[PDB]
């Protein structure tokens, strides 16, 4: 009632009515450089690194394969005990790689080892529902969400969950850290985006602008904004510095829901993957779809952009991941 | 390519060789999705299969490997992970014949068999399981026979008027579950009665999955 009663009177103008004077971004033409083949099952999640070369991808065949994007040469083949993996993350330095399977165990694998095989660093079996997303704050602490409408901050050295974020009503489906890995926003199925903190312990502000199940989420490189991808064919980029909604990107041309949200280095091109076998590129400032990323046989599931904005990776269910530039 | 990328592409070919081999042993084996209708589903078929989170059982029978995946009772909604099991060989949907006159420990908003008919229909309307076949298994054979002698059998279905015999009741409830799915030309429903013999239940499973892998091979060549 009185929560957002005064938040409407302070909004006389919108973000779209201001960015109509700056240089509009034309049609963005992105050509598929190389398609990351070798997979035999549908891809669900991926993650990039700081070097913009290595990347990890999760596949349903029980193999967490890691390779470099510049040469498309498979480096390591990690046999997964739980073939039904739905999420995976990559370390900022490239030491440990975790993946969330259906066995509710975040099996963390150590790459840089004295042996040749990729051994298991730790196992996080504290969750009760399906592991939906995981993100690496550093090589010791990790924030992993699950299908138990809660998030948890696990520690590799400790082995147990430090803080269990229990503030969501719907099923958690996404996670997105900050450029300094201090705060992070999570979007659940209750159309709620909560900004969970580490120093305070848990969320400090929520956003309920959406109308359906939120699938994926990202984070703006600035640190004050973030976009959310729901299932009702619309994305609402909320504001962390004004606990409101800046603008929305909805269109009746598309009918499927959003499955992946990503941001570039400058944050201009809003990479948003959909279930229409293609991916869209939003202006994120004026709500204009510049270009569309087509070429995938099945619907895309994962979408990540390098930290320097060099390459853009799109993964679909056809066991083929494409690299864009 | 100076003594490093030449070995890098060679290691990738060795990995691709293992990945190609990994897909062969994964395609010849049988995958089974065991999704029950109550709190504890598939209480009988998992006793003979030689072994938080899902439970998967790996066992070889008649020179054929089987993988039965059971999710149990989870608080997460099925809509967010029902597309992960797309491409499974067979689906086992165990339903008990003692759900028409029994109510689960809940708010009693709907009957057990009414919720079982809606749960079985919810799987068929999903756009991912329009091709996979669901194998129905009727539990509590003799227990349902004793219930017939002291029940009108028309609790869930009042419009039904038939014989009060296990031979006719099992045949009527089989057609009632076969009329719930709207895709009858794409999906083939297998109905069987779970027996305590400990070898006849998996024999029908082996014969059912053989009828499915023979259709996938015919679909592979294009004769389907």
């Amino acid at each position, epitope marked *: 009632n009185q929560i957002r009663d005064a938040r409407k009177a302070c909004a006389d103008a919108t973000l779209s009515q201001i960015t109509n004077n700056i240089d509009p971004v034309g049609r963005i033409q992105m050509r598929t450089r190389r398609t990351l083949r070798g997979h035999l099952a549908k891809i669900y999640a991926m993650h990039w690194g700081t070097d913009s070369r290595l990347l990890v991808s999760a596949s349903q065949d029980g193999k967490l394969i890691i390779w470099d994007s510049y*040469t498309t040469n498979k*480096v390591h083949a990690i046999p997964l005990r739980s073939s039904w993996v739905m999420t995976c993350a990559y370390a900022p330095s490239g030491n440990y790689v975790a993946c969330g399977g259906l066995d509710n165990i975040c099996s963390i694998y150590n790459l840089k080892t004295r042996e040749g*095989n990729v051994r298991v660093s730790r196992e996080l079996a504290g969750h009760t529902g399906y592991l939906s997303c995981c993100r690496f704050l550093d090589d010791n602490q990790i924030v992993t969400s699950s299908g138990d409408t809660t998030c948890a901050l696990w520690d590799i050295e400790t082995g147990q969950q430090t803080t269990t974020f229990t503030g969501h009503t719907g099923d958690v489906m996404s996670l997105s850290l900050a450029p300094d890995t201090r705060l992070f926003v999570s979007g659940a199925c209750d159309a709620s985006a909560k900004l969970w903190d580490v120093r305070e312990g848990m969320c400090r502000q929520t956003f309920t602008g959406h109308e359906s199940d939120i699938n994926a989420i990202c984070f703006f490189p600035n640190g004050n904004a973030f976009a959310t991808g729901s299932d009702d064919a619309t994305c609402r980029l909320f504001d962390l510095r004004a606990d409101q909604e800046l603008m929305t990107y909805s269109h009746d041309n598309i009918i499927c829901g959003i499955t992946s949200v990503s941001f570039s280095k400058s944050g201009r091109l809003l990479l948003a993957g959909y279930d229409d076998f293609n991916c869209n590129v939003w202006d994120a400032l004026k709500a204009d779809r510049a270009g569309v990323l087509a070429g995938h046989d099945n619907r895309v599931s994962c979408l990540g952009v390098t930290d320097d904005g060099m390459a853009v990776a799109t993964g679909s269910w056809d066991s083929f991941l494409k690299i864009w530039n | 390519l100076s003594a490093e*990328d030449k070995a890098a592409v060679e*290691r990738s*070919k060795m990995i691709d060789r293992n990945l190609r081999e990994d897909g062969e042993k994964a395609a010849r084996e049988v995958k089974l999705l065991l999704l029950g209708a109550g709190e504890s589903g598939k209480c009988t078929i998992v006793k003979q299969m030689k072994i938080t989170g899902i439970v998967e059982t790996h066992f070889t029978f008649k020179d054929l490997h089987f993988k039965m995946f059971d999710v149990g009772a989870q608080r997460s909604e099925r809509k967010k992970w029902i597309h992960c099991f797309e491409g499974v060989t067979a689906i086992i949907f165990c339903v008990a014949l003692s759900d028409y006159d029994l109510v689960l420990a809940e708010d009693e908003e709907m009957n057990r068999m009414h919720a079982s008919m809606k749960l079985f229909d919810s799987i068929c309307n999903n756009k991912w399981f329009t091709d996979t076949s669901i194998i129905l298994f009727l539990n509590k054979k003799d227990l349902f026979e004793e219930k017939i002698k002291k029940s009108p059998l028309t609790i869930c279905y009042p419009e039904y008027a038939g014989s009060n015999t296990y031979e006719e009741a099992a045949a009527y409830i089989q057609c009632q579950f076969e009329d719930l799915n709207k895709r009858k030309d794409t999906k083939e429903i297998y109905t069987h009665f779970t027996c305590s013999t400990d070898t006849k239940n998996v024999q029908f499973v082996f014969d059912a999955v053989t009828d499915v892998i023979i259709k996938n091979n015919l679909k592979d060549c294009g004769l389907f």
Partner: single-chain antibody
Amino acid sequence: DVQLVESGGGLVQPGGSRKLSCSASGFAFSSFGMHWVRQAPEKGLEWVAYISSGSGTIYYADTVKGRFTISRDDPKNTLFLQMTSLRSEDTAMYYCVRSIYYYGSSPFDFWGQGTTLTVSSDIVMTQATSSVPVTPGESVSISCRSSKSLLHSNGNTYLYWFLQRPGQSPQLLIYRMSNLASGVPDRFSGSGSGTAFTLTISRLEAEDVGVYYCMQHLEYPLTFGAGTKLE
């Protein structure tokens, strides 16, 4: 238990062979690819043979091509070395490097203990110095020269530095001329522009002395440096 053991006879007569057998332990086999490097007395290192993972790529040196037959038994985790005829030139201490090649790897990581043997085009890695007598404690610079510029088109220069403690096997100090090895302190710093290849040991503790080597990884056969001993 990552150490490697080698087997070899005391001395062999011309006209036969010893069938040098090397075994592995600890690390996951069938994924690295063993090397063959012999060290003649009062001489420098020299590559002999190398087999890849799975007997795919088999390379021989210009000095042993046609006489030595490198073999292995991966199900046994054992490496063999068949020879046709032994000569007085082959009298050296054969080593196994146990290297692996991928992006972000540490090639030439852990050399084996090595066995002894006694019998009764190519990048010429030259060094400006051979023995630098300097007091330990702080920064000491060591350079290395190459015949061809090791800077490749991708942007990675393949150079590896070895220490070879007196009485032991050489160990990796800095790979790619700029990245520190796994298991070495933060004292080793490597710089250079294609051919300079300067190595600054800013700490130079007591155990840092030994015969150093700089080897290229662009042309086969692989040639090692002349040797730089520190006191």
